[PDB]
């Protein structure tokens, strides 16, 4: 997992040295910003089955052709596999808000994703349209605080640039 802790340890393990004053100075930033990204995480955790319903409808709104006979949303057992795979991505954003870095999105959502979606004829632009809808349906003091939305919409922008 890419985090604040695993970055300064691996930078010192590869050099063979002890945790110095600059390595402890960056864990202080894990304390000054844990408050904002953890109440962005429990807001997402308590209201996740309503968000992935609203997000997964935005890919079947723009790309309505997927329910035609032949495409990836052809029958019913393939439609809930799209809502399952969007709930996978919202669950991994909750993990990156807990850990403090893009680790659970890298190791579990992004690495090997483009090889899988190309082999199974899944368009990556509709795993994106459900994510980009969640990013601009976010109001600044209503859904969370000011700095909780900066953190939450930065892991959504990370997943958008990684699928494109």
């Amino acid at each position: 997992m890419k985090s604040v802790i695993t970055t300064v340890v691996s930078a010192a393990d590869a050099a063979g040295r002890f945790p110095s004053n600059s390595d402890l100075e960056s864990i202080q930033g894990n304390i000054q910003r844990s408050a904002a990204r953890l109440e962005a995480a429990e807001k997402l955790a308590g209201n996740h089955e309503a968000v992935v319903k609203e997000a997964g409808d935005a890919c079947f709104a723009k790309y309505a052709y997927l329910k035609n006979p032949g495409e990836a949303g052809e029958n019913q057992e393939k439609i809930n596999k799209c809502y399952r795979d969007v709930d996978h991505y919202m669950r991994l954003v909750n993990y990156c808000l807990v850990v403090g870095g893009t680790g659970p999105l890298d190791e579990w959502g992004i690495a090997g994703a483009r090889e899988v979606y190309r082999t199974l004829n899944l368009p990556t632009s509709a795993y994106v349209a459900s994510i980009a809808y969640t990013r601009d349906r976010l109001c600044v003091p209503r859904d969370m605080s000011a700095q909780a939305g900066v953190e939450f919409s930065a892991y959504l922008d990370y997943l958008i640039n990684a699928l494109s």
Partner: protein
């Protein structure tokens, strides 16, 4: 005033047979009779209350306004009698905010959404001088209610094409939901309240859930942001023969 959705992709608006029964010497109306009378009452209960699905012992307190509706066949008087009921204030006034009550009066009695903060603040200027019945009778006795509905038809949600603001069509599409929705699902809080007082707009997926069948509901969304940046000044230039002119 053409409006490509209205009598094409939706249904036709319901109502009484004509407005010439008022001028008749020996009747009051083309009399429907109790098969084509009560199915007009089914569309006033579905429109004024939302899809609230009032029970048999909640319909039993509206017996006096129905029994007058089958004598005077005025539809404006039936809507006025149903908005002063207990069954209209226990659903839309009792557990709601003030701009939630006001934004449902525009839905249930006009078929549109409010266009302004100045139009909305004058509805609270009538609350101070007569309560909620001063809001309800000023909507019903307005000029906008007269020249769209009259005494003849139920107040339906009308696709006009020539809206006086473009934002008026947007707030109409958020207020009127899909079929099998109602007006109790958000816990008292007004949907349009942030966008009226700030001057912003609505969310495209919430509007396109309420569009009729056959209208490309939701396509056109680029995968970047859904609203506009007011601070951006773009350079838009036109080609002339020599170079490119930025008439800014």
């Amino acid at each position: 005033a053409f409006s490509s959705i209205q009598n094409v992709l939706t249904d036709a608006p319901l109502g009484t047979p004509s407005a010439m029964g008022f001028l008749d010497e020996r009747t009051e109306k083309p009399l429907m009779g109790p098969s084509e009378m009560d199915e007009l009452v089914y569309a006033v209960y579905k429109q004024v209350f939302g899809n609230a699905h009032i029970m048999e012992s909640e319909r039993a307190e509206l017996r006096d306004a129905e029994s007058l509706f089958r004598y005077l066949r005025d539809v404006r008087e039936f809507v006025r009698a149903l908005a002063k009921s207990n069954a209209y204030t226990s659903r839309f006034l009792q557990g709601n905010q003030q701009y939630r009550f006001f934004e449902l009066n525009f839905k249930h009695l006009l078929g549109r959404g409010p266009r302004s903060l100045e139009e909305m603040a004058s509805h609270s200027a009538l609350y101070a001088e007569g309560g909620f019945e001063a809001v309800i009778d000023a909507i019903l006795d307005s000029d906008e209610y007269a020249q769209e509905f009259g005494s003849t038809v139920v107040p339906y949600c009308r696709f006009k094409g020539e809206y006086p603001t473009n934002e008026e069509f947007n707030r109409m599409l958020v207020l009127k939901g899909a079929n099998s929705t109602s007006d109790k699902a958000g816990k008292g809080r007004s949907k349009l309240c942030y966008s009226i007082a700030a001057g912003c707009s609505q969310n495209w997926l919430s509007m396109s859930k309420a569009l009729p069948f056959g209208t490309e509901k939701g396509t056109g969304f680029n995968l970047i942001s859904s609203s506009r940046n007011p601070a951006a000044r773009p350079r838009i230039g036109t080609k002339i023969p020599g170079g490119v002119v930025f008439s800014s």
